[PDB]
Amino acid sequence: QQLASFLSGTWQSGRGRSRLIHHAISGEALWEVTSEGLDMAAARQFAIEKGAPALRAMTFIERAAMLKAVAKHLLSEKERFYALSAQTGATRADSWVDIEGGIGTLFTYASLGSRELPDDTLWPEDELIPLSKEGGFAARHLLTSKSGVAVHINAFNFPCWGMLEKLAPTWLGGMPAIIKPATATAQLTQAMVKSIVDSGLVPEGAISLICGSAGDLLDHLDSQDVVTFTGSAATGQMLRVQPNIVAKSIPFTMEADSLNCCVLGEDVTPDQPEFALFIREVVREMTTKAGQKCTAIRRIIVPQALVNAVSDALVARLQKVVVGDPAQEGVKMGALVNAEQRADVQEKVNILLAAGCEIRLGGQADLSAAGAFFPPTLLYCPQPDETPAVHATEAFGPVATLMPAQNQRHALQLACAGGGSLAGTLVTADPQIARQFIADAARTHGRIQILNEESAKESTGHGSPLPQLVHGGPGRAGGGEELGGLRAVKHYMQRTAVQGSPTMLAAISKQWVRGAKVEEDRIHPFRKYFEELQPGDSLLTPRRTMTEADIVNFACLSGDHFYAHMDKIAAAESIFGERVVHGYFVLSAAAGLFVDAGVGPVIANYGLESLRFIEPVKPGDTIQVRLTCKRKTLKKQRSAEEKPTGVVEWAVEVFNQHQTPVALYSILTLVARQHGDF
Amino acid sequence: QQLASFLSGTWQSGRGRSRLIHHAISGEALWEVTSEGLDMAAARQFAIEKGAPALRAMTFIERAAMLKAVAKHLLSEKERFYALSAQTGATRADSWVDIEGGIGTLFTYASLGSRELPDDTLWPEDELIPLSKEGGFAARHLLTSKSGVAVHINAFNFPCWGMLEKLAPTWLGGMPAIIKPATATAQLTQAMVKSIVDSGLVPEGAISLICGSAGDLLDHLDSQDVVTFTGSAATGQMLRVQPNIVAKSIPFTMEADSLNCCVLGEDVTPDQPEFALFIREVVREMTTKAGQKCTAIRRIIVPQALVNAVSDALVARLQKVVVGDPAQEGVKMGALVNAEQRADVQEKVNILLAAGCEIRLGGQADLSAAGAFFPPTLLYCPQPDETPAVHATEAFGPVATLMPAQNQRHALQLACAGGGSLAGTLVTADPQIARQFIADAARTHGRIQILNEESAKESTGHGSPLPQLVHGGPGRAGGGEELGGLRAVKHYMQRTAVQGSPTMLAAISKQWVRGAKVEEDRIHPFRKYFEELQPGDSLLTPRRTMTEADIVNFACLSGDHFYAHMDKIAAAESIFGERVVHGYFVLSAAAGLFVDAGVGPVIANYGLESLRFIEPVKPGDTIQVRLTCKRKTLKKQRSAEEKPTGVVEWAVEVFNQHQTPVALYSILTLVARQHGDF
Amino acid sequence: PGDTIQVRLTCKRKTLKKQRSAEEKPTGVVEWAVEVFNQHQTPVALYSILTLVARQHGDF
């Protein structure tokens, strides 16, 4: 039964050398996978010529909506993916974390994209940077989608989450994706790809899949392509030195095997709840996914005195875990994905034992059984500082080593001795211990969780990588970063400093910037609908003279009698030298000047972005307000009856009678739209 | 005369194979450089053991102050550097751009560090990310200094700017630097290093210099080290595939040769000022530094009709440039740095001519003269789309090629055909042309300037890389990024997502976060000095009942009679369903509730960071304010008489009678300090 | 209290004023009818205001 790969817009399979996908439980070969003789250059060309322009033509809002629609479509058909994930030897809980994590990642990226990405094909990331005394020359940073292709090479650990976690920012960045999943679990990935292709929610060529060898795809890539890799250190190190990749300076991101630690604080004792939740956390991370998650705990660092206690409390809890076929009731842990994986894990355990380690709970597995089952294994290292192999060798299975520490600094040294890790946990109740541990060991771990009684109530766990947080680490972990929210998007884009006149930068950004040309229409901007508004549509308001009465009345009404406003004697000795107008009164008076009272397209204010008071305002000063449309962001209608609205940001500039700016800030608004989009 | 290298805290030179530094004008060998037999592992160990902890112990404010002090010290001794830069064959203008650019970079990084980096050894980059319904589990990103060493390998182009542009963010990131300058101009770099070492403003081992070969330093590096490279593509590609670098996943940044373009818009005509300033820009970039700056213009893309005009206007302007010894009056352009450089430039010119190019102004140089002089050269390509060598070969000298374009899209294709560039210029007056050009060609250029009449008045130039903007580009440009303001700092740090209870994250960050434990002292927080304040010091204010009178009075005083507040009929048909209290009145009433009136440590408000109105406030609702100290930032005294002040950020949470948060924002304040620091 | 007022302002009459000199600002008298209604559209106030409005073109 050939596993088809989707490339050049067609489902096709290769001929020649084939690799077998076996059922993890049954042991029967149920797929064979090959891509020999398929034209990889044609696949790349197809993705570039039509997928990439179609994605680039879409705005970020449209791409976020496409992600949301794809997330809903995939969620509707989750049962198929559950059935196919059962073939990988994962329980319902493991399939839940994989599939729902993937779909949750898509939802989260869609929400983030909708909330805080521009309604444009270009992304101005920062505010204008002044570079001249007159303000005739400035610059700002843009992010533009790369015109090439993103090549994602995934591991077998998360066939579905591992795809969508890279696919969501790749698509949100406007880049077509070619996905090369790990062979061992490729059959699952294909199914989701099929769904997406059959959804008709994506442009043609926006997604391609290669089942089997990548052939010579990496030899056909150019400067505008990117490569992401997850798997063994050796394979990624081989790919990093690819002559074509190094010649064209192609961005290459690698995530590799990591020795994730779990440090027990010296403040905790067996009587504390911290002890119990530490044992529970370690066992959960060891047993979930048969410890085949890249964030599973491999090293357990505990105080010397506590060792003999912990070694008991784990084993008993680790004894209750039942390893078997997840279909039958009473199994809480499945099997590994492959017999080859089991042999590898056994080899790693044997290496650790040969390098001075003691079995606390069984490390020998049956290397003749049809199922790829491995018993929960706990090892012990009496000399952690004299055994380097415990800090270099990791078993990609339900295997962890516990080691003693002293004086809370030896623990930090042992945590840092990993040579770089993806995740770390410290279990403590003392804030100072947490501070010291982070300050000394965050440089070697990409994620650290401080687990206490308060956190454990709703903690998503040590091993679950959330889409709002970075997934990566230095050194042995590979040196990549992923899933850092919008950070990930910026890996599929080119950052360009654009210099020039503010007017030119405003036109380039399709956002008004300080010092740019404005349009005054003689129609008040708040009376215009979202569609009639343009960035640069501006109003110069009537003036208002600030009086001593204004200071007194605002201080009375607000209750703020701060000495700088209401005490002459003290204000004489202040930096200003006399009593001044309240900053918030300047803001309030400005609002009075520019706001149109009538019922209109403006729905709500709801926001104020970045307020600085530059110059004091004195009685007898006269303020004037320039109100300019800065940025427009359409909001997709969540239903059919909802009022079609858009987010409009307005730059407000408040000047005095000398035209010197006294207040500069931005307000957010909701403006009603004439035309909806269901 | 041996050129000493500063490593292991000592000035020392090597023995054996030596390379000669010649005077660019005279041609006499005046230095010889060698580092054979010097212990590179000892240098690395020395930098790591004492330089790195000493830098890491310092806060960002202290490190910014160290940068500022070093900048002032270097500026005091600039004449020595001018005299030594004269030996490199650079004019006073070129030496000015190099030395003052370097010192300006140091000043700018110091200012940026002082303004917007925390008063701590850790850097929380973002706001708290909620990850639970109760708010018991959250996460935020920290940046921590790497414990290793930064190895900077620089080019001969900017011996001093090229060092300081990397040194300023490396030190601001808390990382020791080992600098390997290009041999050809190493004598200049050494001098500045000497000054720094002799300043006593830096910790011991915070800076090392290697003059000559790097030996086997790259074989001794670990996961916590970083490498930056500038120079030829071949050398950087060789370094990228170093077995030790690829094994330990050591961050490697490369900047390589780029074919910087200058596109002339189709809207411009010879009668327009745009034409003149285009000619002036192209000639300036060609002639400055004898075109040895990495951002010099190499390709000139002009409309077909304009070609014969431009080809004339350039040549005449290019004829007036006098090439000779800069010491004698009437030379506006110096020589190249080396005879080897001259031979290389001549070889590249000959390659271009062999690949179908025509001389418009002389390309043949005297390869027997003592001085490394090269005449200003202008070439012409009749078939730009049929000659690939014009889009791959660059001459690192005063050489540029002009080529025709058509229909404004062929120009964009030719600009993108460079395969990635550091800088690009478009000369135009039409905003739509600028928009199209950016939208289609920003993905292949790291910096683009739109040059018009308005910009040219104070434009710093096409070739000058400013410290607030990114310096880098994809593909042929190397794929690095540098000088992106604080972005650069983050390349020398590890980004770690820290998860846990808000209380633990507040302790870890030394900044109060939403939902964390607070301290109520029964002393009002505004009455405490900066030193007595702690993040988490909080006050729960008295309550104030919002009334219809309050709405009317605030609308009257401010002048804002928006229908949502002052019209019952319209407010009935709004989303809220009845008239509500002004958001700014909620803000003003909150200020009245928490502000202490008395003369005290609080000096000014000056700021409001991020305001969102979550829930409407109705008449008969009662508001209460929780005011908490969020972040403290000490300000270094610029003089001895200045009042010692610090920036304190306060989180303000305004609730209604149901304890539901109606306003969440942050205010900035200046708080006086008891103890100054001169 | 609790009534909501709305105002219709309409130009009622225009009366040009002859310039007495050459430097005087050319102005005209404009009368405006003001109608103030409540939420039931029942008129609660009816009156006229006088105004001086500047002219673009004078007549010496």
Author numbering:
A (entry chain A), B (entry chain A): 2 to 679
C (entry chain A): 620 to 679
Reported in the publication:
To investigate the performance of the microscope in practical biological structure determination, we chose eleven macromolecular specimens with different sizes and symmetries to show that the capabilities of the instrument span the full range of molecular structures for which the single-particle cryoEM method is ideally suited. We determined eleven structures, with three having four identical molecular subunits, three having twelve identical subunits, and one structure each having 1, 5, 6, 24, and 60 subunits. When compared to the range of atomic structures determined by cryoEM in the PDB in recent years, we can therefore conclude that the system overall works well for nearly all specimens amenable to single-particle cryoEM. It is notable that all the structures were obtained with a single day of data collection where the number of one megapixel images in each case was between 350 and 500, equivalent to 20-30 images from the current generation of 16-megapixel direct electron detectors in use at 300 keV. The resolutions were all sufficient to build accurate atomic models (2.6–4.5 Å), and a majority of the structures (7 of 11) extended to beyond physical Nyquist resolution, indicating the power and importance of combined detector and optical performance.
Two of the others were essentially at Nyquist resolution (catalase and glutamine synthetase at 3.4 Å), with only PaaZ and the 70S ribosome at 0.9 Nyquist.
